[model samples]
Target: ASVQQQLEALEKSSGGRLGVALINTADNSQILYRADERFAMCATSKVMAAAAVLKQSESDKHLLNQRVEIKKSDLVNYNPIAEKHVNGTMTLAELGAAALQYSDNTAMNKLIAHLGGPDKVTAFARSLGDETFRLDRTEPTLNTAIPGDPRDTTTPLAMAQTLKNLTLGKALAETQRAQLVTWLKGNTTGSASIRAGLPKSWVVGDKTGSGDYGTTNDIAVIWPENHAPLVLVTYFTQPEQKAENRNDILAAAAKIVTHGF
Candidate 1:
């Protein structure tokens, strides 16, 4: 089957609204299914925040190592790492790890503040020509379900482009890009998404996000054995969307796409 047909079949089986963008970085070969549809990004926005921080670090050598104390009052519900401490101190490196790798809401909030707030994060995204990606607020505010609030959202195509840019060293320094990719590869969330569909020899660096309002998504850099790496971004939303189904749908898409390579 063609890549689009396989993706359409997976979306049909998902029983939910779905958007997908797959890009071949080698020659910019592309297949986009619902590429313009936007969805809540949830914690996935942490990557933008991280990039902003890294860009700032290019000028401030001590930025990443500077320590910030996370007060208990700053901790909010839905943050697993924050709940573990009453008050704790962490460097940007630590917070970035917690935010991207573990999806710690509190850690993400800290990173956002360190980058000068949500607007700066949004500005960083804009620099990449991402019209659909937005970061209007910090975490723990509307942790989920914000009707019509454009706080945090992105399209699959925008996400795929961001990943492509990262790989091509478009906006960030090579070192910063490497750091981001390493953190993504260490992501502890959404093990059942794209990673679950890959061959044992393949490696994937990715980020996953979900919202209480039925957003289930994953964006990834998939390195197939003996083939140029590709970017796959999948976003799903439905009134009755379940996490397992969201993941399974991406897994199915991955299997099909990688098989074609």
Candidate 2:
């Protein structure tokens, strides 16, 4: 069977929805599977917020160094960084680190607020040519938290394109993109997803997202030894799916794509 055929079967077997985009940066080859399907981006929304902040800082320069006081009210449940600092201060750069490295909800909220709001991040994404992606809520407030509110969402292809743009220095300045990549490389989440499937020699810079209703996502730039890097984005969702199951599916997807290419 073809790669997409295999992936489609896996998606069906898991009783879940899956969206994927695989691109070979070296030759611009791409394989997109269910690329248009939208899914809750979950914590991956932090990456968009971070990009917006970085774009703003490009002009101000000082914005990166600006300090903001993290209020006790800003602390949200399930966030390690916020838990560590019930009340404290951190620079915008550090906030970005917390958001990307640990998927800290409060950190993402602060970054989004610093960049203006969800609308601003949405505009940034639109400016980068992502039409279907929409971000409508602040961190720690999943669609599950608010019955009718819009969920933070993006298509697999949109995420893959965004990562490709970042790699090519279109979304943010090269320096800022490098900083974001460094944070992603140091990510403390999604250990069983994309990166877990690759050989140790391959390097990956990625951001992850998971939702209460079995949504799992990983968007990444993978650098294989002596080869041009590739961009991969995967979003998987199954109602009440186990986190371990989600990770296994993602790992399987990653391995199939890498070997197939």
The lDDT of model 2 is 0.80
lDDT of 2 by residue, 150-223 (tens): 46888888888887887655788889888878888889896789988788678888888877667778888898
Evaluated at residue 207, the lDDT of candidate 2 is 89
Instruction: Tell me how many residue pairs clash in candidate 2.
Output: 0
Q: Which sections of candidate 1 miss by over 4 Å?
A: 142-149, 240-245
What TM-score fits each model? 0.92, 0.93
Regions more than 4 Å wrong, model 2: 143-150, 240-245
List the lowest-lDDT window of 10 residues for candidate 2.
142-151
Q: Considering summed lDDT, which 10 consecutive residues are worst modelled in model 1?
A: 237-246
Model 1, residue 81: distance off in Å is 3.0
Q: Provide backbone clash counts, one per model.
A: 0, 0
